[PDB]
Amino acid sequence: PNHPLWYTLCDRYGLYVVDEANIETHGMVPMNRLTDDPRWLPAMSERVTRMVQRDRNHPSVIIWSLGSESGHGANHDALYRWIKSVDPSRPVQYEGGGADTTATDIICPMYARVDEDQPFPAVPKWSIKKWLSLPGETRPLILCEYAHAMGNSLGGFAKYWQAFRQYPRLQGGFVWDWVDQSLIKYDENGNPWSAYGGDFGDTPNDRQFCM
Amino acid sequence: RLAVMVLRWSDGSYLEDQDMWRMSGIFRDVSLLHKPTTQISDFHVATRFNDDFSRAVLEAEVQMCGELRDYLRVTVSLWQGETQVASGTAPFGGEIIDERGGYADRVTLRLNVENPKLWSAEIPNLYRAVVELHTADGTLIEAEACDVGFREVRIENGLLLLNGKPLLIRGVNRHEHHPLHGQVMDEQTMVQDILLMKQNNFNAVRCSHY
Ligand SMILES: O[C@@H]1[C@H](O)[C@@H](O)OC[C@@H]1O
Ligand SMILES: [Mg+2]
Ligand code: NA
Ligand code: NA
């Protein structure tokens, strides 16, 4: 969840907002170790319930999200349903555990490609065009993350937009991401420079992957 | 002496506007068939399966014409080569259908078949069904027969399945055409066409458009 003012400005300038609970357990093995564990349901529920209690009056908020990269566990399903009961007015999405689980109203993959399948076991990333028509699938598809804009990037961005406009159920996506997470350091002369992972003695680090 | 007056054009021609040579004549086989007064007038074969196709039921509905008699029977027997795998015999008189009763002139035979050899284009396993119309005490009135392929065609969850497996149709449209004989078909040409299709990895054909 964002600084309360963010929503106010989105209400007034006009932007559609995905409001997202503060839950990410990426580093767990497997990803859903905590989110499938009922002992972690109370801590997760407060991260979802208190967000909704806070932001439910903002028109700019159109979709609720259960969090980020935490696999898919029973706690997601429980909290999915909680929001659906309390607020029928907004869809719920969640990308974890394959982007098309029972905890999501929207097929919301990250970095699924336009035409090329990535058939990872258990959590494949299908071609977004293919994903739509998988036997029994009916939901819309909006990429929660796509076109990873790291350094000299956004190659093939136009391939996405051609597909979005041609397919009714391909309804776009959210680029990853808006602003580089570089920090300011100063040299011996007081001259500012842009720093990334490791420049603060922080170790282990992931270098420029913050940008 | 037979006399046949064939018209090139009729109101039927309004429903025969296929993209092809427009011809006319007696272009398929003519024949004479002798059926007894008491006769098999129709018969339908169905095959249904359990979930993994390890059990089937062959269901044959047989219709008669002629005078109804208590001594009348139908036997449907199922043959795999020279081995009889299944058989059933019953008098005429189907189950009750509505307030007025049932079909006294029909009977349905149900034969159990364990581990049936399934039909497909990959392996065209066939059985032989023989439909005998006869007296209870053993006099055959007549027999009809057909080739039976055990297979299930269904659409499930958006997929066309044959025997539980999604098909991939390597098909072709095929008109009935011969450069010398026009629209008259013969065995040799037919067999030739099929051998070339299968040799070229086709598994399906569409009867375009008749
Ligand atoms: O006329 C043929 C066919 O019957 C039609 O459907 O498509 C064109 C083809 O040449
Ligand atoms: Mg035509
Ligand atoms: Na679209
Ligand atoms: Na990053």
From Swiss-Prot, chain B:
Homotetramer. Belongs to the glycosyl hydrolase 2 family. Keywords: Glycosidase, Hydrolase, Magnesium, Manganese, Metal-binding, Sodium. The record marks 175, 209 as: Transition state stabilizer. The chain holds residues 184 to 393 of 1024 of the full protein. The keyword Metal-binding applies. It comes from Escherichia coli (strain K12). The keyword Iron does not apply. Substrate binds at residue 19. It comes from the Bacteria. Induction: By allolactose. The gene is lacZ. Na(+) binds at residue 19. GO terms for molecular function: alkali metal ion binding; beta-galactosidase activity; carbohydrate binding; identical protein binding; magnesium ion binding. GO terms for cellular component: beta-galactosidase complex. This is Beta-galactosidase. One of its GO terms (biological process) is lactose catabolic process.
